[PDB]
């Protein structure tokens, strides 16, 4: 990643074995559960495009998703080129060439070039631009691999309300509220929840159906 | 987090894989036991709002609690806006815009903005303000998920007093003393504890009923 | 903790996930065995009162002991107030208010205040004062939870002397020597140990009864 | 590796036990799966030729592949010598001798010499040149050890399309697309995929055959 | 420990959780095998007397050995006092009082005092003096707990010579050579070893009896 | 080890618990397999003679090999003394005494003396000299403990050629090529390998016999 030292300047640091192993392990254990995306974002803190490609390419398996990810990345890279066509001309001594979409995705740009953009004044945050592309594609994978629709999350006749709400928002998070939660509750709790009236908090709702 | 380097200035550091994994693991193992809250507070030492949201969002499951947490956060964010309405106007070069509740919760503010508030002179500690909101909501979850009331913690007729006191204050901690501990003791120990008289320490009480 | 950087000034550092997990694990595995106290003292090296409270509060369970600990802490805090009554008056710019017992215990003092005392010139070591209070209370727990008295540690008729001495000083350490070790030895070894005479070292004693 | 300190100069750092163990473990667990190559590249970030040889030589077993790797390395070293024949002459005080292929492979060059090239101005990146040689040879091993050809990856009559695409691109990655993926689909899905028409994305294709 | 920073001055660092756990674990696994002593010495690199006492006191169990260790430490502390009787007098501003044996053992000296001696110019290395006392006592424990004498290490009639030599020097190391190794070899190998003649290396000896 | 800080000067650092444990573990798991030697060399990066002796002495067991190692070390130390007889005389203020073989092996030299040689200008790299002695002796152990000769590595009549080549070069590495690999192949593959002709690469050979 590009990180500030203990003297105040942004320089490059090698991606750590702990970071590499942590990303691989969470994919092995959680696949594309929704909470994997913020883990990817945190573990790729300050990452260059090279670091982002490293993390994606160390994933063995799930290659259908990884190739969907590449298609989304190329879609965003082409949009970036439509909005930022580069102007031919010699690069001045204190400057960096404008990046193309494939430069931001780390496929046609060098590490020194990525360091140059990210540490520029003002910086061109090609790592953060690329990461937003990756997260966009990762979220589309989470939705597509989401097995259950929110319409099929219904409280059992003897299921504790807390467990039902857990499943409800787990499903809703992957699918990407308060009235549907009432409608899919069981007859006994739905009766209690209507007596509460509109505008009840989740805490009030869960308290009433305990 | 925002941490001081080894040269005396507050700068941003990436949240560590050890920190990320430690928060996830303690939630997996302890759910919302009371001792999880001080662990969350220590592991989020110096955290930005972005780091706090990272930690909450890496939690998979327990989504009923996580959504109750969001409702509490929004309640505190709205109160903050009622007490700190921002004044429209251009931000001077050496300054930071006042934050709104959603800025402190990290949803409408950038990392550079959070760094700017937290490292300001004087600093606006949006991380500590947000963390207090989160801990407020986490504590309400601990109470709601507390299974046993203190009234139902009674010493068994052959239960060692030490084990009973353990259960007593474990329950009391989650529910959020000395006379109730005597009343719920078994007949043999309660007889000993009355002979001790008022003002006995816990050590004296546990010594007498051994 | 408050630690010196690599440039010679005392500044605050966040308590590490390794430190937090190490304290929790040793309590889970060893409870209140005597050797847990020096582990607590080493892992709380340079700790602020906030760090000390963090470590105690991350302990789930053993709540009878943790509440005995609080009673001891309050006893020492009240003694400190009896010996150091603070003088009302405005705090000068380069100075820190005197701390009260509850300030040293980290309950009525801020982290900035604890940093201010500990890094003062001369420093007010509120962390070391608090830690001595905690260790005082922890040692009283070790004695109370010590199951066996030294009077009941007697060498078996076929028990190797080395194993008996192990149990002897394990028990003696928790209860908080040379002649009692001889008296509780078995007839065969006690006969050998009297022939050795007075002033024998433990090494000489264990050598003679092998 | 050669890394920048926290003061801005490139100096040598010892390869870490975490790095050494991480490379050994991934080879033990994954052998020469395709995703092992980017792991090797990341864990050898900033590596000298000495560090690269260290990592290769710590691999026990797979000695057929390791010897194929040496043959590829020697092939690239001989090509380098054909393109860069060194000119005999005394090395000036502020300078470094040109490297030969075996110097870049770390067999005829010292660590101080590798440090000198890599930290030169301009730098001769003998580590990155060597690493590209190693990765070239590693990729030829991945292809040769690839067990299944892409022609034999066909969707089962009841196999979910997602699982088939996973196997398809796992195989394709090791062998080193859209129309072959359709042709090898089962009759039911292939019928759906032709109705979609040309130019369908992978996401559209996987959505249609669900 | 007392360690040099990255700016060239000796300052105090807190003993690490990794160090604390590593010492505890090796004692749990290896007790007082001979190789435990160099592990203790390495893990106590740069340790203060306080750090050395921390490591010894975190050992639970083996209390017979730990008390023998204290007796040896007191013996060396008394010898030190016999050789270095301190001269009464006021300590000048830039100076440190001479240490007594109990000061070096960390029982009557503060951490600041130990830092003062160890970082003095010239330094009084109370940590290294104490460590030599500890290692002296630890080695006497290794010998006393050594179960087998070298006289009882004899090669079996079908035991491979390599395995016999392993046991031979394992035993000899704990007891604290070439002709005894020949005499205790089996008849077949002893016959071969006499034909070799005097002055044979261990490698020659093991080669001949294979 | 002796390492450069983040300010450009060579100073001493304590050998890490991770380094100590990594060396012990690899010996426990791999004994004296050939790949253990480069692991020892990497984990002893920048090591002093004291660090090298620490690593060797923390090895429990394999004492036949460790004593063969000492004999080799003494042989190299005596050769060093034959080539570098030291000249008696007072050491000037800015200088270091010449080292003897036992000084380089860390048995008659202090750590400060080893630091002085290794950080001298020009440096006397007693650590690297000693390490070469150790590796020399370690390699002789690998050969002696190598169980199988290369002459006995022959491909089975149904053994895959890849597996046979693996065993071939595993054995050859420990014993310390292309025509012997053909001669020991099975009749079917040897027939294919002769038709290939001379000068075939290992990749071509393994491809032809698949
Ligand atoms: Cl995976
Ligand atoms: Cl790849
Ligand atoms: Cl931009
Ligand atoms: Cl509930
Ligand atoms: Cl969870
Ligand atoms: Cl999220
Ligand atoms: Cl404020
Ligand atoms: Cl009790
Ligand atoms: Cl516990
Ligand atoms: Cl708490
Ligand atoms: Cl004070
Ligand atoms: Cl004994
Ligand atoms: Cl392997
Ligand atoms: Cl090798
Ligand atoms: Cl070049
Ligand atoms: Cl799908
Ligand atoms: Cl133990
Ligand atoms: Cl103790
Ligand atoms: Cl001295
Ligand atoms: Cl042998
Ligand atoms: Cl071993
Ligand atoms: Cl030793
Ligand atoms: Cl030399
Ligand atoms: Cl093959």
Residue numbers in the entry:
A (entry chain C), B (entry chain C), C (entry chain C), D (entry chain C), E (entry chain C), F (entry chain C): 1 to 176, 186 to 219
Sentences copied from the publication:
Here, we determined high-resolution structures of CA hexamers containing these RAMs in the absence and presence of LEN.
To examine the structural basis for the resistance of CA(Q67) to LEN, cross-linked CA hexamers containing the Q67H substitution were crystallized in the absence and presence of LEN. Based on the 2Fo-Fc density at 1 σ, the His67 side chain adopted two distinct conformations. We will refer to the His67 conformations that point inside and outside the inhibitor-binding pocket as the closed and open conformations, respectively. In the absence of the inhibitor, we observed only the closed conformation, whereas the CA(Q67H) hexamer + LEN complex contained both the closed and open conformations of the His67 side chain. In the closed conformation, the imidazole ring of His67 forms π–π stacking interactions with Tyr169 and a hydrogen bond with the main chain carbonyl oxygen of Gln63. In contrast, the side chain of the open His67 conformation, which is shifted away from the inhibitor-binding pocket, does not appear to have any significant interactions. However, the closed His67 conformation sterically hinders LEN binding.
